[PDB]
Every structure is written in C-alpha cells, then in structure tokens.
C-alpha cells in the first residue's frame, strides 16, 4: 500500500523523521519512557556503531523511541507513518499502542497514525525491531538458542549467506500528511512503435474511493507539457528513448478530482525503452545488449547496510568512467533512491529479492518455510519497481538448492508471480550455484535468461588458472547446449584480493591473480556466442560473519570498502570501453 | 536570523530537499533550465565522487539545481530556504532572481522565498556554490590565476591548512513555512544555587513583531512538567546537573501568542551547569576537571566533509569506551546535529571558528584581511551554540601568526567579541603554534585557557623521543611560568602511523613508534600541575591536498579512516580509564 515513493505536493506534506532516536537492545514496554541512556541514529544499521563485539552480536528486539510533534491535520487528510524499510522484522507503535507490522528487511511499508491523535500535541513513536532469520525469513537464517546457565536465553543467527546480518532502519522514515481520497498506486506502460518514434501509453492509477476526473499531465526533461489525458490512455509523437548511459525521463502528473476540485496530486517518472529476450540475446530497444557491471550490496563503513546516497552516486560515477552499464540489487532490494538514480544516469538494474540462503548445509524443499515470505517479497517488489525503466530483469532466487528434488515446483509459481505481477512481463532468471550444473539442475527452465556465479580458479581449481579455463569453457558450452535459445549472464566471478599483497607467481589474494583470473575468465566468455553478460563479484569488499575463509570480510571487490581501486580496475576500464553497450555476439 | 534548530511544529512546517540536484561545474545561467547530464547528492562534499582529478580539483563557481514543487502556505505564513552551510561561499536564486548570498562554509543561513511564488505549482532553487579561499575568507588559502594559454582561467587554491578543501553543500537544506511573526532566537542562561540543588532560569525570547504573551513551559527528562512562566524568568528546585558523560537535558517549549491564539511554538533543549576558570583548574560544576580526548575532522570516506551523523555516534561511542570526555571542533564549527549529540551524551565541546591558517607561509598582519570574515564567524558560531551545555570553551584561532607584531591588535577585539556575544560568558582560548615560544608570544595573555599544539619527537627533534622529552618539558615549564593561573591543554600531539608498518627499533611511522611518542608525552605531562588536559591529533586519519609530507593524508589518527583502531587505542584506552574525568593534579 506504500509503494508510492514519498513526495512533496501541493496535497502531500512529507516530513522526515531522521535524527537521534532513544536506544536499547533487549525488552522495553512501549506504555513505559524508553530513556536516552543509550541513543541511535535514523538511518543506519546499529551493528558497526557498537564498540563491543557482544552488543555488536545481539540478536533479538531492539527499540527505536522519540517523541514526535504532531502537524497541523485537517478534517480531509489522514496522517501515516512512512517507512523505507526495517531490518528485518517490525512492529510499529503510536503512545503505546501497536498500529502496525512488517516482516522483511527491505522493502517499505506504512502505517496509519490513529485519528483520534491528529489533535493532540505530541505522539510517541516506538519502533520494535527484531534482527532474527530463520527457515521462515528471506535471507534465510540458521536460528538456535542457548541457556546461558544465568536464567536467560541468548539468541544466534548462523547465517545462511556471504554477508554480515547488519540490522536496524537502514532508510529513511517519513511522517507523510495525505489526503484520504488519495491516489494510492500509479501504472505506467507503453508500446512502442516499429519505428520507435511514437509510443501508446496506458496509465491505470489506482485509487481508494473514487473521483469524477482522473487527470494525467506527462512533461519532458525540459518541463514541457507533451500529452493530457482523462481516459487512462495517451498517444505521444516525438518520443525520446531512454537508453543505456543515456537516460532519458518524462513525469507523469497524475490528478485526481472531485466535484471539479483537486483531491490529491502526485508526479511519477518513466522511460521509454523496449525489452525483449529472445534467440540468445537480451534485447533493448531492439539492439543486442552486452552486460557489463558488477554484482553489489548495500554496505559502505560506519553506516553498513544503511542509506547512503552519496555512496550510490559514487559507486554509479565509477561504474560510468569504468565502461559499465549495469548492476545486481545482490541479495536483497536496494533503496528507492537507488532505483531512481539508476533511472536517472541510464544504469541496467537486475532487481532481486532477498531469496538467498535456500540451501540446507539434503532435503532443502522440506526444511524451506519461505513461501509466504517469498511471495510477500515479490509482491512488494514489482509493485514497488515496476515503473523503473532501469530495472531490466527479475530474480526468483540466488544460488537455491536448484538441484534437489521439489525444486520445481517451489519455484514455478514465483516465477510465475513475477510474470503476473509486472505488467510489463520483464525477463525473470535464477541466479545458478556451481553445485547445480547443467544435468542435475531442475528449474533453470522456468527462467528467461540463464545467469551463473562461477568461480573457476578460486573455489574449484584454487590458483590452477590452466585447468579452471577448461573447467569454465566446458560446463558453459553444456548450458549453451541445454538451452540453445537462453541469453547467459555470468552473475558473480572474482577472487579475494587484499590490496597490498603482491606476487611475480600467479598467488591467490594478490593483486595479480586478480588480473590473472578476469583475463582467463574473459578469453572464455568471448568465446561463447550465447553468453550476453559480465557481472564481477563484487563492485566492492564488504563486511562479513566469521569464516575460516573470510579474511575479516569479503575481499572480491575491484574497489576496496573505501572506494580505492586495486590493480584490476585499471584493466577492466580497458576492456569495458572496448566492448560497446550494444554489442552483437552472433555477428 | 537562521541561528535556531529546525524543528516540526504545530507553527512550522519543516521539509527537507535533500537527494539528487542537478549539478555543474563551471558557469550557469540560472535563468536557465540546467540539464540532468550531471548530478549531485545534498548533503555531501561532491569532490570524492568525482571519477578524475581535474573535476575533484575543480576551483570556482558550481551550481545545484532542481525545480521544487510549493506547498501549502498560508496568509501569515512565509517561506524559506534553510541551509545547514554551504562551502565556501553561495549565491541562492529563485526563478532566476538573486535572493540570498553568504559568505563561509561551516554557518547555517535562512533565505527569503518572494511571497509571489507561493500560490505556484512550481519554483527552481539555484544554488551557485564557490569554493574560492583567499586572504580575506576564513579558513585563508592561497588563491591564484594562470592562464592555461587557450585563453581561459584556472583558478588554484593553496591551502594555509592542513585538510583537504572539501566542498560542496555539507548539511541538510530546509524549507522552512513558518509563521511571518515568529521566534526568531531563544537564549537560555542559568544561576546554580549554592549547594547545587536549586537553579534560577532566564529566557530571552526574541521575536519579529510583538505578540501579547510569552509562555514557556519546562520539561525534564521524562516530559514531566517542573515549570512554567509568562515572565521569561523561572525558579526550579531539585534540578539535576548536566555532568561529564552523564548528561541530563531540560527543554524548553516557547510559545509566543497574540490576541489569545497560538502564534507560534519552538522547543529548545538546555542543560543546567557551571564552568568556571581559577587557579591554573578547569571547573566544571566545582569540580577540577580533565580534559581527555581528541582533536577531530568533519571527515569520512566518500561524503568528504559531509554530514554522517552513524560517523558522529560511532565516533563519540568510541571517545566514551575509551574513557575520554571531550574533543575540539578543528577546525571549524561542525554541524549542529554533532553539537546536539554531544549535548545528549555528556561529552564536552570545545568550540572552534574556521580561523586556521592566519600565517604568511614575517608580516603576517600586514597581509591578512580576514578581520570582517572573523568577526562574523565569532558572532555566528556564538548565535548558533551559545545555548549547548556541551560547549565549554570558545577558540578564537588555530595556529596563527601569534608572535608577529600586529597580533596582539588583531585579536584583543575578538577576544572581547567572545565576551560580549556569549551570555555564559564561557573562557576562550587561541591554538597556539610551535614557533611561538613562550618568549615569543604576544597574544596568550588575552586568553583564559593555554591551548598548545607540540609535536616534538615528530616535527622537531624526528624519531628522537630522548631529547623531544627534555624539550617539551622545558617548554612546558616556561608556560606554567608566564601564565601561573592559566590552564594548560594540550590541544594537537601525535605522529603520523600507517597501518601495518612496525619495528623493534622505535620508528616513526610505523605502530609501534606511536605507542613510544604517546607514553613520552604523557610522562612529561603528568608532571605539569597546570596542564589540565590532553587532546590527541587527531583522532581518525582524514583527507589532506597533495605536498610530500603527506603520505596520502594525514595519518596521526588513533584510529583509521574507516574507524578501525590503531595499535595505540589499547594503550590510551587503559590510561583514561585510570585517569578519572574529575581529576585535581594540584592535590
Ligand atoms: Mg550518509
Ligand atoms: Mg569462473
Ligand atoms: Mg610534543
Ligand atoms: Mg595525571
């Protein structure tokens, strides 16, 4: 009911409720006064911000409390509060009273205020968070409990994925003022013509109660006023395409009345692009896409999997200088304003949601409790990101157990939600494991698009660079085989590189081997016909648990956690400038 | 003017326009519309995010811009553009039309909205940003012109400092409705009885127009109501002090009303403590105190000098587990969020203008035209801070040219300026520099509080802890001489240490060496009866420009860039754990 991105109208007064937030890790009775003994920031993940390793570690409910002054709110409007997202779990309360809930860590929802407070002076806001995954959550969690011999019980979540459990309200929290008579979802799709100079746009915009005009205004990038519209359809001359580096966006003002009044106003963004799958190649605008990119995360120092919009802009300028175009919400939804800057700067967005860890250590399809959650995360997602012209394709899953038996018929269904779901039937893939392989996969034929994290000279072949060339032209010859008429997309391949360790002989985590391993692994891609994309892993190091084989973090990046390149970077700036946007691999 | 925290109220209507503007570096028109092909994320320094050299070592104007959509204002209602600072220098334009200038980067102003724009759909805000630092801008640089022979100019600014020149607009922007006649400042002073236990309040409340009554309400900790007056004065019993570390806030809620109706509301937080100079002692609340902690920087990966208020809570919950107290705004004042977080967790604040860098690299005063930037400095900083508990000391200059004829002229009115603006009348130093021995110094008589920054064992006598020993003593003796009853803190002392470095042999730069040179100070320190403090430089590594003496930055930090700590955080940690916060070295 939130997937509307918060904004400032002439009918919607959006206020942000960032700042210092009373704090405490463990029990708190939301009728009581949390005290400022200990206080937190909004947003950002609490982990990092912790000097102990045992606070640091803490597992369970967590409270976010501050007292808020309640705005002017008129007989018409209703207030709610807005939020980007709670990691993972939450249950929201206004002066000691539960107005709402959540489950999952990152996606945004919204609760409705009680209008018997909109006269008051002052409301408390609690917010309870709980960091706990399971066999129930998305990502999937290993949970278990202790007897601490004290009396009480301590809580741990092993994890079931390569990245730290950073928890707490990583994005932004608005106190939004709306009209009840509100519009309450927005639309947009568009056919193009054949010779891509006109489009037919269809704009369904959802409402509550309802209206007698349903205004829609669409304007260029020079806020010229191209099309008007009161049947939910229009036609458009002179279109610009939104291309790849090359974006290009009209806003859509949609405006609701009522006895020839105003009721409620908001501008939404789209593009004009084309995207189809077909023959073993990805389509945009119907020229042949070449993927080139990396897989990310949300992690940054200090703030971990919390907002950073400067970090987003960073990262994005990079992967423009470096001759990229394209990058993988890896493992989880990323934020709004990510999504919409990758609109902006013309970047291929893979959207994913957080369904990793669907793996036992058999019989993973049995022990897997994730349906709902899996279903609620795709829901949320298509309706969230489906306006984005820079998302691209969908993933059910990263690295499931594709190979055990019930696979299927898990996944059919979700991929068939993702189809349902997203009006504009955008290609859906699965992101493979190496442990599903050609014969003993499953389900990589519900996908459109078959996309891989192999790691050939790093986990298998470890430093054996001559036989891991063999190894990874051999089993992507197989998948070209199995689905001849399947684009294939490499999602994650890189090697752990401390920046500083150095070698004349080829040593894994130098900074060499790294160069050595992309130069191998590139020499066999270009030889496969089918395989239409490259995405490292990962754009960045970032924080994980503790492993034997994590060097205090993962250390794949191209860039360092601080954004320094390694040595690596200097080569991929070659060839990704080399290798076009458009680039047709069947000649 | 600007000088009060923007907060929501019932009266005011407060929005933030951070997020994604559209950005140029190099001339604009802002009558004309500025194309998305470049953007910029407000708040943050834009220089990190920029992918060359050149663009990062961009001098001159760059330009924000975004078309922002009105809201609702009412018929005694106006509208401003509140900006937290803009660095250096701005120019603020409306549709077009010039409403707004200021001149330095670290203050916030307000600027007008034209009352004819409130009933459009639409306004565009420009901001034209400047980064240019010369002899007449605090913090001074050295500024010059050479023509690149193509016919156009490149600007360069020299740094007389030693931190890289972040810009760029580093805090929150606000617009800001509030009511035309509003309260416009709110100054809170207090007298502690004589056994603590009682306390007698004054409030100024300053207001546009007149209004009929002034109502202020006083709640403590746990919103309890302990106060209220119609005379701007109020006597509370069984106060309970703002102490080190252990801080205890009261607010203030002020509500001016004219003609029986709610004008406007604004709520101000305050905390009840004394501070008093005598006897070469720091007092605070009676009590000798001393000062543990450090010397900081507004400065992180990626956001430059931008705000992070995660950076801000992870560094004070650092200074706090390591048993400090305090730390120094160096240099310059930082942001208001960092000032009401230290108010919030008791750690004391030694406030600092941006003037670094009053030094010809004699005749200092005969070149330095900094006179009007430093009086404004002083009078903003003072407006914006003055009601902080946290705020203990007032500092007037960094290592200035101190023992240069003319510099005594040059800061006695400033000094007084100090005196004059803040109704606490709180003690106000100057950062001294090593070139100014105590026989050299013309201007430390005019302070109440000794502030040193001595490097020796780094700077003079490198790598020689020996004889840097014998000459910090000595000059710490001819201080305590010259001034009997001044206290002495030693405000910068480290020694650059890059993380991993390390030898048997004592030397600089590795991790080792740094443990050496901290416990050879802290021996000489710990026999000076009026050194009352010490302040580490610095505590985290930060960004500095390009000369041979910094090895990429400046790496004196105890802890890294990214907040991890150095070998020496153990050490410093069990030294101010032993050392308490209220500590008499006169016994
Ligand atoms: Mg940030
Ligand atoms: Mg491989
Ligand atoms: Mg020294
Ligand atoms: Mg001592």
């Given amino acids: 009911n939130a997937m509307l991105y918060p904004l400032l109208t002439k009918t919607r007064n959006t206020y942000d409720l960032g700042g210092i937030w009373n704090f405490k890790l463990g029990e708190h009775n939301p009728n009581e006064l949390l005290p400022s003994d200990e206080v937190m920031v909004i947003p950002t993940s609490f982990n990092d911000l912790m000097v102990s390793k045992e606070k640091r570690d803490y597992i369970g409910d967590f409270w976010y409390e501050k007292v808020i002054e309640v705005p002017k709110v ?8 807005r939020f980007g997202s709670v990691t993972h779990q939450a249950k929201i309360y ?5 107005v709402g809930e959540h489950k999952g860590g990152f996606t945004p929802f ?33 949970y278990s409990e202790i007897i601490q011999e004290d009396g009480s019980i301590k809580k741990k979540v092993r994890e079931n994925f390569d990245f730290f459990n950073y928890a707490g309200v990583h994005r932004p929290l608005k106190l939004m003022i709306r009209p009840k008579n509100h519009i309450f979802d927005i639309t947009i799709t568009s056919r193009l013509s054949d010779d891509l100079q006109s489009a037919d746009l269809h704009f369904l915009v959802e409402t509550n109660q309802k209206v007698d005009e349903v205004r829609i205004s669409v304007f260029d990038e020079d806020n010229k006023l191209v099309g008007e519209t009161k049947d939910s359809r229009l036609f ?13 966006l009209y806003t859509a003002r949609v405006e609701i009345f009522v006895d020839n009044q105003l ?32 897989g990310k995360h949300e992690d940054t120092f200090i703030n971990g999997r919390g907002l950073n919009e400067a970090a987003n802009l960073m990262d994005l300028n990079l992967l423009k200088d470096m001759g990229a175009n394209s990058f993988r919400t890896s493992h989880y939804p990323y934020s709004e304003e990510m999504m919409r800057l990758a609109d902006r700067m013309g970047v291929l967005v893979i959207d994913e949601v957080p369904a990793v860890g669907l793996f036992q250590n058999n019989g993973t399809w049995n022990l897997m409790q994730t349906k709902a959650a899996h279903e609620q995360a795709i829901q949320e997602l298509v309706k969230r990101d489906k306006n984005h012209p820079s998302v691209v394709m969908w993933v059910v899953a990263n690295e499931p157990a594709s190979h055990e038996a019930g696979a299927h018929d898990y996944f059919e269904p979700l991929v068939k939600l993702y189809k349902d779901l997203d009006p504009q039937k955008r290609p859906v893939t699965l992101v493979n494991i190496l442990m599903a392989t050609p014969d003993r996969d499953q389900v990589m034929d519900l996908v459109d698009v078959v996309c891989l994290n192999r790691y050939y000279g790093w986990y298998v072949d470890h430093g054996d660079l001559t036989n891991a060339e063999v190894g990874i032209r051999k089993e992507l010859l197989e998948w070209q085989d199995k689905f001849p008429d399947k684009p294939i997309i490499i999602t994650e391949y890189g090697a752990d590189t401390l920046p500083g360790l150095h070698s004349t002989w080829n040593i894994p ?14 020499r066999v891609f270009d030889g496969i016909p089918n395989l239409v994309g490259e995405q490292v892993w990962n754009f960045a190091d970032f ?14 990046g191209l860039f360092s956690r601080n954004r320094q390149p390694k040595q ?15 680039h047709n691999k069947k000649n």
């Fill in 263 to 294: 009721q409620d106003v908001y501008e939404e963004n789209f593009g004009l692009r084309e995207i189809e799958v077909t023959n073993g190649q990805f389509l945009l605008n119907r020229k042949p896409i070449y993927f080139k990119g990396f």
């Fill in 110 to 142: 919204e609760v409705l205020v009680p209008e018997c407070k909109y006269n008051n002076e002052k409301i408390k806001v609690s917010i309870c968070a709980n960091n706990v995954l399971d066999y129930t959550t998305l990502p999937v969690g290993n």
């Fill in 74 to 81: 008129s007989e018409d409007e209703e207030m709610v509060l």
């Fill in 509 to 522: 985590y130098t900074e060499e081997f790294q160069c050595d391993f992309y130069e191998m692994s590139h």
């Fill in 543 to 556: 924080e994980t648990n503790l492993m034997i084989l994590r060097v205090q973090g993962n250390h794949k």
């Fill in 94 to 98: 206004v002066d000691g009273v539960l």
């Fill in 236 to 248: 458009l001359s002179d279109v610009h395409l939104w291309e790849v580096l090359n974006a290009y």
């Fill in 568 to 582: 690596v970077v200097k080569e991929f700036k070659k060839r990704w400038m080399t290798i076009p946007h458009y």
